[PDB]
Amino acid sequence: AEIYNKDGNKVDLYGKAVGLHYFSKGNGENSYGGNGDMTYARLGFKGETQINSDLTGYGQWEYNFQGNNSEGADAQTGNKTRLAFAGLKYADVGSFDYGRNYGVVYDALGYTDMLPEFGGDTAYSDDFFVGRVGGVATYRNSNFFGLVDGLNFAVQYLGKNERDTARRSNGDGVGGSISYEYEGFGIVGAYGAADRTNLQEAQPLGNGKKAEQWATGLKYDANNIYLAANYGETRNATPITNKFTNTSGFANKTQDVLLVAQYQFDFGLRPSIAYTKSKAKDVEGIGDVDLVNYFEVGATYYFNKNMSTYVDYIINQIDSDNKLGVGSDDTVAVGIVYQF
Amino acid sequence: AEIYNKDGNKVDLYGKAVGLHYFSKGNGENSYGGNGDMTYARLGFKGETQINSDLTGYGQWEYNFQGNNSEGADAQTGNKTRLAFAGLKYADVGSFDYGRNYGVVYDALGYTDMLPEFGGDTAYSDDFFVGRVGGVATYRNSNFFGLVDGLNFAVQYLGKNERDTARRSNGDGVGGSISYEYEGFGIVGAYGAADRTNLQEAQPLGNGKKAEQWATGLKYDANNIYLAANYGETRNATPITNKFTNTSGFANKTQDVLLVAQYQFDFGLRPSIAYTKSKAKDVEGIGDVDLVNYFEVGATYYFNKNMSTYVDYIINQIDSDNKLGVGSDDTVAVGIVYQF
Amino acid sequence: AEIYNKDGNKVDLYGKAVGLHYFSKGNGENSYGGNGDMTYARLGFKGETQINSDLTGYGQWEYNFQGNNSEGADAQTGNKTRLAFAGLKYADVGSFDYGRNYGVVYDALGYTDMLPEFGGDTAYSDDFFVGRVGGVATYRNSNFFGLVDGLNFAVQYLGKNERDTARRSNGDGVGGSISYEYEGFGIVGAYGAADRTNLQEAQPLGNGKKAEQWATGLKYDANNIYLAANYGETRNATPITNKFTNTSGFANKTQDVLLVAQYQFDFGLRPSIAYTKSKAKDVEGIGDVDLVNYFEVGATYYFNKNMSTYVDYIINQIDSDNKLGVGSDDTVAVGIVYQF
Numbered sequence A, B, C: 001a002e003i004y005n006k007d008g009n010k011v012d013l014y015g016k017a018v019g020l021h022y023f024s025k026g027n028g029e030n031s032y033g034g035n036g037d038m039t040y041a042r043l044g045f046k047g048e049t050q051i052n053s054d055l056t057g058y059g060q061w062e063y064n065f066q067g068n069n070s071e072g073a074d075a076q077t078g079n080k081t082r083l084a085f086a087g088l089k090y091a092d093v094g095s096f097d098y099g100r101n102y103g104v105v106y107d108a109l110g111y112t113d114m115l116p117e118f119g120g121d122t123a124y125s126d127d128f129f130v131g132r133v134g135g136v137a138t139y140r141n142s143n144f145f146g147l148v149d150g151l152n153f154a155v156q157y158l159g160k161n162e163r164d165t166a167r168r169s170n171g172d173g174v175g176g177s178i179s180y181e182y183e184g185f186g187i188v189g190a191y192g193a194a195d196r197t198n199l200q201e202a203q204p205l206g207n208g209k210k211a212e213q214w215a216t217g218l219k220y221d222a223n224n225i226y227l228a229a230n231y232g233e234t235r236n237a238t239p240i241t242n243k244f245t246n247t248s249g250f251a252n253k254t255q256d257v258l259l260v261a262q263y264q265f266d267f268g269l270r271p272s273i274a275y276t277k278s279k280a281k282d283v284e285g286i287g288d289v290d291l292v293n294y295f296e297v298g299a300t301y302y303f304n305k306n307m308s309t310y311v312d313y314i315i316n317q318i319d320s321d322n323k324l325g326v327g328s329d330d331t332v333a334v335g336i337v338y339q340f
């Protein structure tokens, strides 16, 4: 919501209250997404300032607050700052910003990240370029300097984060993306490579001094029709773990595939069907394993831009022989979102 | 404060800065409410959206930030999300919402929760229906479908929360309330029952597979006069603990009584006297014990709707033989609230 | 940003998104300020209410959110409530407020706290009167009751905080400040003394039952010129630690000196040079040690009141023989701030 707009500075304060529950068999512990209360809320601000006719400054922060913890010792569980960056935009030169932000490969992966609740499984946070990460400097160019409508590109420097856990760490890295869009049709490619920390290399899963990710996507998006596909691969980048005695690390390689179909009726209903498969390969002591394998069926109903409800059923194709212990049961999310 | 109201959506951003100190003998550790700095602040939003002539959507979030922690390792202590829910309201049918919210029995207990600082002792958070809890679906009806001014009712489903601690856990449960109000007089009843988790049943205090709570209240509230009484009982629901070697659990039964009297002068002063007694019964290895026993004397002075100050003296009737180690000393809160 | 102003109540919601990185040799662990991502964001509110012609009420809260943690187990690291207080201001009598707030000696120390990123080294948080602390009641007087333009003074009661750590604890204490300002020239003095907790006295560094701090400062500030000096001393107040086997405590005495020079060009650039030295004395098992010794060179460029960038190079004069293990390498901060 734009709550402030005076003297060339505007501030959008935004957020939402998601009442949300997951239904899964027994424990949920061997299901796709777990079981129980999942209610949370978001809060954030974007600001933009007109510096002059061509120059623009901006900053943005967004925070997650779980609503399914007690007021006791677990109050903070799942609470995090999702985004925090500032930058500048100049006329037809492009934008530069720095802070915690989405990695370039997410420009690709965003194509199928459209399910009511789930999906976008390959866009892990703090995982190099595939989702939100700390310490990205990002340059982006719009319509190729104003010369070429619908063509964009970005380049990114991700600095190293030697965190406590191998899972959240990364070395210095470089990435980019290009996308073209014409009359509801778009295509995208993105690639990034980065060094692994010593602590990542120390883990029993994953071997090698460079993590790599790339993804391509192709989409149809107009006339109330949404269709999109993603195919990606990774090397040494996808976090994996055993379920029982935690040995963790990274997948030596993965193959990712995301298919999405959705239709937007004028009265507000939007059915959605989607299929997602992700498989690891050359995992040590395992060989090949599926990490994600499912079909999805569900629907969102928009009352208006502020209020919605949705159902998301995950038909989980993993099965309980899975060598990594990936849970095999299904999951339904029912939810109700107010947002401003 | 209503900071946004455009195009059928309105957003109230609200909060407060409470400067607050507790005075108690020596340590405070054997007093009613402790001793030292107690300063905190709240932040929150309510939103409401006109979907059509009869249908309304809303969401709400509210957070607590302690102001009496350092900027070091204890920064987060006492910090929690208090409320997070969304729902819908239809014309004369009622409202439905889901998320973290107040339990129905709090519709009763709210009658005496009016002291400057203390009181409302029986409305524990994360304690089934008596205060704030995660995972309530709540339906409410206003003036009985518009047919009956002043008569309300609600029904609630509380889903299970198998938390880490017995104290914060609960099984699935069902509750309700009815209230009638006529010319400053009101009466209320509320009841809820729920299953206990296995981890609640594992504790040395508390015996039984169902927690129960109910409460009734009767009040006078007009012409600057506030008077209200509450009588309630619980089974297996009231959290209790030893002071010295923590054995915890729940009270096999309790009897609760809350009496409140207050007067609102036109210049802004509002004296308040109140008495509260809560006693446990059939506690294992104890028998009967008082949990709460005190008289209260105090006053709030309202400068206006945004600014106030108050004193709350607790004359603590517990005494230092108390078999559970409930502290026996008195406590005074002096405070200063700005709120927007 | 003033987002609300209706009916005698106004609320300024404010904050910022700092994209920020530190450059230092190797680890950073033996540098002045470390090494890596340092991005963070602030959020806060000030409110003010016209109670009548002379009486004014206010409250304020401000929070820090790090943007350089993951979304995993370290999400909360460095997150804290910085300020939370409320009070009242009466006509020409002065203001009284209570909560978490700046200690009086910070009225002095604020003179040299002007570097782009660093500086203000002696204004530790939760350190009696030198920075932010919990439980201050503060009275302040403006222009000496309206009688004397440019002359101010304050008096402060800091109540005890028996925290878990000696570092964050304090006894009851009393402080004050006076300042005079005439045509861009100002001078300030401030002093505070307080009792130490038993847990502070238990530490191997620091000896004595009273912590003391005082500081004086003298400044020039007009015609785009900023110049200011600070000289201060402490007894039993400055937190010190070994680097390798943590023995901690307080410095038996310190001598502080801060010099600052800055120039504000009309186009927006503001170079800054500054020098800071702080040395401990009578430290047990050490004798004398420098805690801070450096020169600073840097610059901020203001695009406007909302958007800036800066560089701050610390030429670190500590050297790697330092008996306490204070890091000896240099540090450069490059940053980009959006603020509203």
Ligand SMILES: CCCCCCCC/C=C/CCCCCCCC(=O)OC[C@H](O)CO
Residues within 6 Å of the ligand: A147, A148, A149, A151, A178, A179, A180, A187, A188, A189, A216
């Ligand atoms: C198998 C891996 C495949 C990876 C897929 C990466 C896709 C990246 C997009 C490239 C667009 C290349 C140029 C396309 C745009 C041409 C310019 C144009 O369309 O318009 C000209 C007009 O003059 C302007 O208004």
Ligand SMILES: CCCCCCCC/C=C/CCCCCCCC(=O)OC[C@H](O)CO
Residues within 6 Å of the ligand: B147, B148, B149, B151, B178, B179, B180, B187, B188, B189, B216
């Ligand atoms: C000992 C335990 C006691 C528990 C206490 C529970 C109290 C619940 C209230 C019930 C109200 C019952 C109906 C009262 C309202 C009657 C309708 C009325 O008052 O008004 C009629 C008029 O036509 C409309 O405008």
Ligand SMILES: CCCCCCCC/C=C/CCCCCCCC(=O)OC[C@H](O)CO
Residues within 6 Å of the ligand: C147, C148, C149, C151, C178, C179, C180, C187, C188, C189, C216
């Ligand atoms: C070595 C330690 C030194 C510590 C340094 C502490 C400085 C504190 C300031 C004191 C000002 C004393 C009074 C100065 C103001 C005099 C009044 C005046 O200037 O103006 C008169 C006029 O009538 C009004 O409008």
Ligand SMILES: CCCCCCCC/C=C\CCCCCCCC(=O)OC[C@H](O)CO
Residues within 6 Å of the ligand: A098, A137, A157, A158, A159, A160, A172, C019, C020, C021, C023, C299, C300, C301, C309, C310, C311, C334, C335, C336
């Ligand atoms: C007065 C104008 C001042 C100048 C305005 C500057 C704008 C700064 C913006 C973002 C910082 C981006 C920093 C990205 C740093 C990554 C470096 C890294 O990751 O490690 C590198 C290695 O140590 C070898 O230096």
Ligand SMILES: CCCCCCCC/C=C\CCCCCCCC(=O)OC[C@H](O)CO
Residues within 6 Å of the ligand: A019, A020, A021, A023, A299, A300, A301, A309, A310, A311, A334, A335, A336, B098, B137, B157, B158, B159, B160, B172
């Ligand atoms: C397109 C329209 C989609 C439909 C819109 C739905 C609105 C959902 C609102 C709240 C969820 C309430 C969930 C309450 C669940 C409690 C269940 C429980 O606690 O456990 C039950 C047990 O496992 C046996 O299922």
Ligand SMILES: CCCCCCCC/C=C\CCCCCCCC(=O)OC[C@H](O)CO
Residues within 6 Å of the ligand: B019, B020, B021, B023, B299, B300, B301, B309, B310, B311, B334, B335, B336, C098, C137, C157, C158, C159, C160, C172
């Ligand atoms: C109806 C009007 C009600 C009255 C309005 C009151 C305004 C209160 C404001 C701030 C509290 C400041 C408290 C500062 C307390 C510090 C005391 C301390 O630190 O310890 C002292 C020792 O225990 C010996 O009491």
